[PDB]
Structure 1
């Protein structure tokens, strides 16, 4: 059920803190990296931090944060790319992807694009 999203860019797991902050951590024992990927329309998902009880959202300026409620900014197209990694592209801000920098900080949506390592994730069991 619950998965962890491993990013190819540095090997950080996407983390959703109880206060709404989003970043990455390499420690598999962190309680805030267990996520629930719920399907909405075919190929679209919402991403919830199980412990934080919040949903990942991408803002109009590219920021990543986690909301207590589900809005139109909380849905992402999940695609299995040719290299067998997944990407998560905002349904609202259609050219932007969820991504992490090699420092463990998230990468602004407006700076992402296909071919970047930052956008590649491997969902794993928790």
Structure 2
């Protein structure tokens, strides 16, 4: 392991909104595969269904479009039509409260799913432990 194994409570029984305390945006996967954040709770592309592959590993899927969150080779998030190795994330508890998601494929590089204050996604290499951008709270839909 390149990372700790403190896991968040909660489960995957129901879909969730992934709220980023950094700018106050919900993670969004647009039909065209674009990934970003929005403060509009009514948005139909922020409802996400998480599922576990192995303990602590998850897929994060758009309930509206069926797409999987993924991080590509240059650290950019995108919506993938199918589950590949870029769609698995290490879901961990952080600061004894939040949920963080590390790219499994690029786990050794500490690339996280993250949103900037302006609602744009962070590119993998620009994220790291200790940032506010990587902190999420799963909220009921």
Runs of 4+ in 1 over 4 A off after TM superposition: none
TM-score normalised by length of structure 2: 0.88
Matched residue pairs, number? 126
Q: Secondary structure at the match of 1:56?
A: strand
Q: Secondary structure at the match of 1:73?
A: helix
Shift of 1:107: 0.6
Aligned to 1:70: 83
Shift of 1:83: 3.4
Check whether the contact 1:9–1:102 (CA below 8 A) recurs between aligned residues: yes
Check whether the contact 1:18–1:53 (CA below 8 A) recurs between aligned residues: no
Q: Could you tell me which runs of 5 or more consecutive residues in structure 2 were left unpaired when the two chains were aligned.
A: 1-13
1-side partners of 2:99 and 2:126: how far apart?
18
2-side partners of 1:88 and 1:45: how far apart?
9
Aligned to 1:15: 28
Farther off after superposition, 78-87 or 32-41: 78-87
2-side partners of 1:83 and 1:121: how far apart?
12
- 2:139 is the alignment partner of 1:101: no
Aligned-pair Cα RMSD in Å? 0.7
Aligned to 1:87: 100
Q: Could you tell me which runs of 5 or more consecutive residues in structure 1 were left unpaired when the two chains were aligned.
A: none
Q: Deviations over 1:66-112 (max 9, x none)?
A: 10000000000000113300100010001100000111110101100
Check whether the contact 1:19–1:52 (CA below 8 A) recurs between aligned residues: no
1-side partners of 2:96 and 2:137: how far apart?
11
TM-score normalised by length of structure 1: 0.98
Aligned to 2:65: 52
